[PDB]
Design a protein around this ligand. Structure first.
Ligand SMILES: Nc1ncnc2c1ncn2[C@@H]1O[C@H](COP(=O)(O)OP(=O)(O)OP(=O)(O)O)[C@@H](O)[C@H]1O
Ligand SMILES: Nc1ncnc2c1ncn2[C@@H]1O[C@H](COP(=O)(O)OP(=O)(O)OP(=O)(O)O)[C@@H](O)[C@H]1O
Ligand SMILES: [Mg+2]
Ligand SMILES: [Mg+2]
Lengths: 127, 127
């Protein structure tokens, strides 16, 4: 895949660690561009900047060349903004965890489910 | 991924051609073992053998080393047998198309939906 969209919820009390190896492997296939996105509640400039900082800190966990990482912050519904960016990039692949790591009630979380169903590109659900 | 499960519906009047590049790429990441599975209605020996022959013919479309391809025929519910084999292999990845290529009513077909939700491993929905 050329353009890989990697949505990350920065509030994940516990980060979804298993996505790291998958993002790294998928990126190595074609030296993809890796686009990290976090969607926050909709001052806002300050909230956006702090969200971007947290997202870059998470991205430090990934072995991907610096030149290939790109960062995006959006506001509102996570599924809507994930899908809008997948369309506009456009993404060749979206890589999403099945749900938050500490919660097992739902086999797919609401955003994972929507994104796998509605994306126009391939979607890798990681567990 | 080490063991990749690739379920194929051999009756697909039109084969899902976009899965080829994805299976091939995913297999190249770690020289995975690639397990093709087709699930048929439940003489049966003859039906199983003919189904396996059709499945091997489809597999000829894929650029994967011969040593790494493996073939499986099961009987009954496709989602149940896909998930059973994913568990028993065990599969590190299941690669499935979103739906049949000629039918657009449902953004996810019934088997794609079940498998993405219920697999214990990562699942790549291809479109
Ligand atoms: N606010 C967000 N911004 C970016 N990506 C997100 C956001 N929320 C969820 N995601 C993406 O979707 C994945 C699955 O999260 P999801 O929210 O679907 O599960 P959950 O939190 O367990 O369920 P729910 O939010 O429905 O209670 C996350 O790992 C992440 O990739
Ligand atoms: N009988 C089968 N054996 C092996 N894999 C199958 C079978 N049926 C479906 N699949 C797998 O699931 C994928 C999606 O097919 P699915 O059956 O979910 O979609 P569909 O045929 O459009 O929907 P439906 O069967 O619900 O009308 C297929 O491309 C294939 O990977
Ligand atoms: Mg959530
Ligand atoms: Mg079907």
């Amino acid at each position: 895949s050329n353009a890989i969209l990697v949505p990350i919820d920065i509030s994940d009390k516990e980060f979804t660690e298993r996505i790291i190896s998958h993002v790294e492997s998928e990126a190595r296939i074609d030296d993809a561009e890796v686009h990290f996105l976090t969607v926050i509640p909709s001052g806002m400039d300050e909230l956006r900047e702090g969200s971007e900082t947290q997202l870059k800190e998470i991205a430090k966990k990934f072995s991907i060349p610096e030149d290939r990482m790109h960062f995006h912050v959006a506001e509102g519904s996570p599924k809507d903004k994930i899908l809008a960016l997948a369309k506009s990039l456009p993404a060749d692949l979206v890589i999403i965890a099945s749900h938050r790591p500490d919660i097992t009630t739902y086999l797919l979380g609401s955003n994972a489910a929507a994104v796998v169903r509605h994306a126009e590109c391939s979607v890798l659900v990681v567990r």
